[PDB]
Ligand binder design. Structure first.
Ligand SMILES: O=c1[nH]c(=O)c2ncn([C@@H]3O[C@H](COP(=O)(O)OP(=O)(O)OP(=O)(O)O)[C@@H](O)[C@H]3O)c2[nH]1
Ligand SMILES: O=c1[nH]c(=O)c2ncn([C@@H]3O[C@H](COP(=O)(O)OP(=O)(O)O)[C@@H](O)[C@H]3O)c2[nH]1
Ligand SMILES: O=c1[nH]c(=O)c2ncn([C@@H]3O[C@H](COP(=O)(O)OP(=O)(O)O)[C@@H](O)[C@H]3O)c2[nH]1
Lengths: 297, 317
C-alpha cells in the first residue's frame, strides 16, 4: 500500500507519476527496435480528484514523461530493472535542486526547459552511442525525464544513476572542471564541493588503470562532436580506514563508477568518477581531457 | 500484461479505466466508516499521449469514476474481490447499450446523465439499506459507476452483478412489471434468438415456477422489503427479470456440443438470484429472479409497489 507520503507535495507527485508510468509501461510490449517517433513521444496524465485520495496526494496535478520507450530501453541497457527503479522512487519519499531516492541509488535533478529541449536534441545520438558502448561509459546514465505540474507551476526533472556510492559514505567530493575554487560558504558545508583549484592545492591524487582514460577520451570526443560544453567530472573519495557489511566493500554492478585504490596508495581508499552536466566546445574537449589525464597514477 | 484490445475504442477505455481505478484504489487504505464526503466524491483522469501507446487505446481520452470509496465498499458488501472485478473487466473485452464481461459475471449498462444524478440522490440510503440487509436483496447490486470520454463524447456506465448465471444457459426470459396495461413483446422481439417476454406473454403461456415453500418465502420477504424501499424513494418503472434454465435441455445441448467431436447445480455465492425448482415438480429447472431498472424517479410509487408485488406473488408456486 503505497501512500505517497513525502516531505512536500511535489515529491508525492513524482512518486505517484513514476509508479503510474512504470506500471503503464509494463502493459506496453518491448519493441524489436526503437523507432524515430519514440524519440518525439510523450505520456501525459491529468489527475482531478475531488474529496478522494487527498491524504498525501494533491487533488489536481499533471504528470508528463518524455520518450517513455527510449528511457525504458536506456534503463534496460544500463542494467536497471523497471521494478527496481519504481521501488527506489515510490517505496520512500526522495531526500535532499538535487534529490536522491531514499536508497541513494538514483539522483533526481531539477532542470530547465532549455535543458529538456537540449536532451531532446541529443537523445537519438546519445542512445545510439550507448548501444555502441554496451553501456560501458562515463557519461550520465539518463533513466527518465518528467514534467510535473503542481498548483499551476511546471517543474522539469531528469533522473540519473548516482555517481557516488549508495552505501559507502563518501569523504571528499571534487567538481573538477580560467580557474575555479570553492566559495567559503560552500567550503563550510557538512560535505564540501571542492572545485578544480583545490584538488591541486590539496595534493590529493588517485593511484590506480589506463583503460579509464580510454573510455573517457571516447566520451568527451562524442560530447564535443555534439557541440556540448560546460560539463564537469565528479570525483568522490572514501577513506576505508575512517569506518552485516564491510569497509571498502561494494557491489560493482550497483556502484558502477567505483574503483579500488592501488596497494601503492598512502591511504586505503575507494574512488568514484563520472561525467556530469552535459545539457547546453571543441577546445573544451582537449583542455578538460588534459586536466583529467594528469590525475591517475 | 494487458493490451486492452477491444473492437471499439470505448471498450478499451473502459478496460483501461477499471484497471486504473482498481489499482489506484489498492493504495488507498480501507476506511473504518464511510464519510459523507465519500458520497459526493469522484476521481478524474485525462490522458493525452503523443506517438505513444496507441495500438489499442486512443491517444486522448478521459475517465471519471463516481464515489469510488462507496462502490468499493459495496463490492465488499456483495462478496466481490476488487482483484476479481478488475480481472473480469480487463482480461478480455466485454461482449454484447448492454455488455457483459467476457466471463459473464458482471453487466455493464450505458446509462444517462439523469440516471447518474438519481444514483447520487439515492446512494446513501441505498448503501445503508444494503448494510442493514447484509446484501440479501433482489435489488440491483451496484459495483461501479463511470463516465468515459472518447472523441469528445461522454458515456455514462453502471456496472452490476448479473441477474443471470455466468455458467448456466438461460432458455426463456421475461421482463415483468405488474402493470395494468398490456405489456406484450413485439413480433420483432418475439423473433429474436433469446427474446425477452413481457407480462401478457408470461400469462398467456401459463408459466408458473415451482420453487418450494422455503425459497418462495425467502423470496417474497426479500421482495416485500425491497419494493417498500423503492416506494420510500419514489422510484418507478422497475422490472423483475426472470430467467429459466432447463436442466434437461442444458444436458442435451451440452452433449450435442461434446458429440461434435453437477447438472443443474449452481453456486449461490455467485449466482445469487438462483433457485432450484421443487423436488416434486414437472421439469428440473433453475430460475434467476431479480429487480432491475431502479434509477428512474417520479400511478404512484406506493401504487407501483402494490401492483408489482401483487403480480410477482402469484408468478411462483
Ligand atoms: O445529486 C447529485 N449529486 C452528485 O454528486 C452528482 N454528481 C453528478 N451528478 C449528476 O451527474 C450528471 C452529469 O454528469 P457529470 O456531473 O459527471 O458531468 P459534469 O457537469 O460534472 O462535467 P462536464 O461535462 O462539464 O465536463 C448531472 O445530472 C449531475 O448533476 C450528481 N447529482
Ligand atoms: O551525490 C551526488 N551524486 C551525483 O550524481 C551528483 N551529481 C551532481 N552532484 C552535485 O550537484 C552539482 C552538480 O550539478 P551540475 O549539473 O554538474 O552543474 P550545475 O551547478 O550548473 O547544476 C554539484 O553540487 C555536484 O556535487 C551530485 N551529487
Ligand atoms: O442483470 C442483467 N442480466 C442480463 O442478462 C440482462 N439482460 C437484460 N437485462 C435488462 O433487461 C432490460 C433489457 O431487456 P431487452 O428487452 O433484451 O432490451 P431492451 O428492453 O433495452 O430493448 C434492461 O433492464 C437490461 O439491463 C439484464 N440484466
Amino acid at each position: 500500500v503505497k501512500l505517497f507520503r513525502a516531505s512536500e507535495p511535489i515529491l508525492s507527485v513524482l512518486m505517484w507519476g513514476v509508479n503510474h508510468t512504470i506500471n503503464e509501461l509494463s502493459n506496453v510490449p518491448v519493441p524489436v527496435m526503437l523507432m524515430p517517433d519514440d524519440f518525439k513521444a510523450y505520456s501525459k496524465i491529468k489527475v482531478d480528484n475531488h474529496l478522494f485520495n487527498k491524504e498525501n496526494l494533491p487533488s489536481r496535478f499533471k504528470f508528463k514523461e518524455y520518450c517513455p520507450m527510449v528511457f525504458r530501453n536506456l534503463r534496460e541497457r544500463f542494467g536497471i530493472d523497471d521494478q527496481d527503479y519504481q521501488n527506489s522512487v515510490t517505496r520512500s519519499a526522495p531526500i535532499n535542486r538535487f534529490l536522491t531516492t531514499y536508497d541513494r541509488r538514483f539522483v533526481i535533478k531539477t532542470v530547465s526547459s532549455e535543458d529538456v529541449a537540449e536532451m531532446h536534441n541529443i537523445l537519438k545520438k546519445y542512445h545510439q552511442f550507448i548501444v555502441e558502448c554496451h553501456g560501458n561509459t562515463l557519461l550520465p546514465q539518463f533513466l527518465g525525464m518528467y514534467r510535473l505540474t503542481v498548483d499551476g507551476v511546471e517543474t522539469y526533472m531528469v533522473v540519473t544513476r548516482n555517481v557516488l556510492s549508495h552505501r559507502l559514505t563518501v569523504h571528499r567530493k571534487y567538481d573538477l572542471k580560467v580557474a575555479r575554487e570553492a566559495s567559503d560558504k560552500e567550503k563550510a558545508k557538512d560535505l564540501p564541493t571542492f572545485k578544480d583549484n583545490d584538488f591541486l592545492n590539496e595534493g590529493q591524487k588517485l593511484h590506480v588503470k589506463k583503460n579509464f582514460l580510454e573510455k573517457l577520451k571516447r566520451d568527451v570526443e562524442f560530447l564535443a562532436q555534439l557541440k556540448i560544453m560546460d560539463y564537469s567530472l565528479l570525483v568522490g573519495i572514501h577513506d576505508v580506514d575512517r569506518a552485516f557489511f564491510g569497509p571498502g566493500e561494494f557491489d560493482p554492478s550497483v556502484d558502477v563508477y567505483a574503483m579500488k585504490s592501488h596497494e601503492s596508495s598512502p591511504k586505503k581508499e575507494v574512488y568514484f568518477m563520472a561525467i556530469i552536466d552535459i545539457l547546453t566546445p571543441e577546445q573544451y574537449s582537449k583542455r578538460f581531457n588534459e586536466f583529467m589525464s594528469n590525475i591517475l597514477t
